Amino acid sequence: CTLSAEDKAAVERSKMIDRNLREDGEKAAREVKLLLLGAGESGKSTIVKQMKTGIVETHFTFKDLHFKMFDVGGQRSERKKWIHCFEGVTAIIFCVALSDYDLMNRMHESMKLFDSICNNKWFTDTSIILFLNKKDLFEEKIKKSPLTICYPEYAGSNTYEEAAAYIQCQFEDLNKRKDTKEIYTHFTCATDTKNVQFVFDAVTDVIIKNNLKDCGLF
Amino acid sequence: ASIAQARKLVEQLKMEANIDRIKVSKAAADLMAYCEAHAKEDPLLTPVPASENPFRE
Amino acid sequence: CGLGFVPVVYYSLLLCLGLPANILTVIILSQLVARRQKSVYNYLLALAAADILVLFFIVFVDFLLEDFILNMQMPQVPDKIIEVLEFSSIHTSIWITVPLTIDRYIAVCHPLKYHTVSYPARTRKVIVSVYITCFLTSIPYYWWPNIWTEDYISTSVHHVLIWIHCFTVYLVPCSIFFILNSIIVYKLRRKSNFRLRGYSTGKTTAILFTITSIFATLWAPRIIMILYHLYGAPIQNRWLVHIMSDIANMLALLNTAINFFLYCFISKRFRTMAAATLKAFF
Amino acid sequence: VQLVESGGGLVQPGGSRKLSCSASGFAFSSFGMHWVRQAPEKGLEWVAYISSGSGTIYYADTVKGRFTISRDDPKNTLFLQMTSLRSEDTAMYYCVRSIYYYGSSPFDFWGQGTTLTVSSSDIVMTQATSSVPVTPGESVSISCRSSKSLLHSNGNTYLYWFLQRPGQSPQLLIYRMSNLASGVPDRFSGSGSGTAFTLTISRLEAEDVGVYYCMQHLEYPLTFGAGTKLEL
């Protein structure tokens, strides 16, 4: 031993702290972290109101799974210095206002930020749960406002069923690494309680892939 | 607003320019005279014997 | 007999292929970043240690010293002790894969409960329990059946012991391997198909099939001849017994040689970690 | 941060009871608790111990086997089950919390204690003459020796100092050679060398009056000393 009584007791207390730290780390290992990103408009808050400072957290459990959501749209700083602390996040949630094109344009800003997040050197293996909200409003203003106002290469008809698919594929054509990660898309709306289930299914898929990579099956 | 911030910048620049400076030769002499005067007291520079090192065991 | 130089060279190549590989696996996986992050790393460390014990105790002791190098060991204490220890080694090697495939099944079929049911703290208990149980269960092998020394009558204690060994090494493990791997393939192909992944599903199916089939095929003859010895016939040509039993044992131990590749060399994460450890280590 | 002891009474010889103290106002789950007892008119004596998490239980020689100590974190109460009570277990038992880390102050807060009535290899620490005549406003140097050198290899002498005002519980004064507890004035300052120890009071008022004790924490039995009573 070659230790004194208080030294031994301090070592015992340190071992207890080790046990508590390991238990807390195990607790956090069961928790799914979901970073939240958005366009210039604060659609993240609007959508999360339906599900019910700087970084804000929204803890909720769905079908026996603790969820973490990190809305960092209020940082108002340079994203480079703090985007590196967010690697290891299970999936990145990104919202695009489908009706926000007839306004560099705002979908182009959204594409810029999407490119900077998907192609960032930190998020090579991190999936992105893309959300294309305001679907009714986009279907509403699609006829009056041609898509050439933001898509000079778009020559299809100004009808919703194709005008949404073109945007979805255009976003899907920004990840230069289509193998290390995958992009999930859901044309959400202001009236949809199924978005939680979409996120749940995507998270189950991501954790399945992570388990396969851990076990070597992938 | 822009006029005010430009005025603030020019006033700060004026205050900085009104300073008294010293020659870099003298500055470097002072800096190198601090290490020599404190050389023997550096555990990292001259390796400390293991008896006096509190990290031997 | 000019065939005597075959087993020695085969087991020499066996050791050369296995001991460096498994010792490197142990060195890489013994780090704290491995034992605490993923349970698969702990299970693979246990599998590598069990494989090292298998290689040493069986190959280097028996098939080299007791068959080619020394071959006059006093029979009572040390030969039977070596038999017990090597049966412990094979039991540990085969029953560390069982928790490994159970962990894989949980992680692929119920991913939500994977971190709740399986974690390094529990896998430590499982590994130590498996080692202790195998060490205790291998004591009945002290009175292991003797065939090569003389053809004589095998009594009841040999029958039950050989049945227990056959079950606990080949039959129950292969059955659970088959069930778990078939169900994980079925639950990886059918239920979700959300991303329509072809490459990952094909690679996983190929790996699982090349695990199950290779284990069954390599452990077939070593059990088939025991079954034929017991229930088949008293057929003569004791020499043929030595020949094909030796080849069956070589196949069975080639299995535990290639488990290294088939379990940890496939993992791209393990390969990257191996490169990183060799770099910083070297 | 009151830590009230409950239990005690007129127990028959050879009987048994349980002593419980309810911590109210600190991290009981992290504080390691000590049991000490004081004869009706004599000095103190260590009894038991439970570390944080109840993972280390150490006993005195007299109470070994006889006494079983227990800890209850959720109720913030510490127990002491006593079996086969002899005629010498009568005392006013005291509950002592103690937290052990670098820079800590073990044996800091002492409970009010409860009374007990039973009807009809160690470090010897001694205090000189057991009595000192003092007057207010002067200075007094209380000294107490030991049997073994308290200076461990890690450099800190494992000595303590306690004050028992009449009809009160002991306090913590000097929680190592040349230390000072929280809440005690700058007047108290004791420093020693190896086996010899001293404590000096700069200008004693009527408040710092009573019997003083010094105990060792190097070898774990924690032998106390006699009392150096101060009085006019």
Add this chain to the structure above:
Amino acid sequence: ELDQLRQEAEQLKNQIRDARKACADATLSQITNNIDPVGRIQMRTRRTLRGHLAKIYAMHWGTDSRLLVSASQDGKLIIWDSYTTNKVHAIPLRSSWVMTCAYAPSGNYVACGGLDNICSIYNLKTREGNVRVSRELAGHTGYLSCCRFLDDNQIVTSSGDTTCALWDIETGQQTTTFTGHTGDVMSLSLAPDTRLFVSGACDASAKLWDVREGMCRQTFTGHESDINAICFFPNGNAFATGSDDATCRLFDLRADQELMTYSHDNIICGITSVSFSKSGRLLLAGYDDFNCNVWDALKADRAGVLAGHDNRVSCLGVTDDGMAVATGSWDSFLKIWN
């Protein structure tokens, strides 16, 4: 007029550059000729503090040169004992996203902060046993880059916005607010006299402030990219920085210049930490190439390299007695070199 004001600003900047150039006789490299080299520095990993489970982002030493504080991306903030590897405390954080940690000179308090824009100050020594949040310092818009304790009552902070702040504990308000920067302001370093302090920003410009008068005395330029770390010379008349330009520079307050540049062609990754040794002859710089460095102060020559960390070194500091240097990294370990 905007045009006239900008022309005046440009010509004053040119005048300042001319004054700086006119007061340069001989460079530091030329002055430090015929001086013997430090030589190889064979530091060895005496202690490895393997308790964390996430990236070590910040570290700070106690004045006793024995107690450490480490902050990681998990909600934990461990206080270690450097001599005997132990854990004095495990402080749970209300926000796991932390970027800084500060150990008070008296040892009574520990401060931390991150993306929450809050400089949470904790009370280590309380009448109870647990560590509790003393004050939650609010008033910053951007993330908290670094904090340093002036005393038990005061603390300065480097925020995410172009603003540093001098807070006063016991009343959440900030006394003097320093607003002269552009872009994010990264770590700062107080002076021993506790009257001035240098700050590093992403505008590739460091500034020496006066904590009493609240103004900026003089500014230092030369870097080509964001300054990620800054350390202050023990004398008080110099300081050195670290940038993503894969270089470090030593400035002098009474000369206002850059004295000589710590740049090797073999390095491309930036610097995350910088710490002068005692007497300021060895400068430790933590680089992103999973590695550290030991840079001689008065000569550009490079001493040994501290290759012990698997991931990026995000934090390192020297003790007050200069007896050991502990370096943290993005792998949860935190080694102590001597």
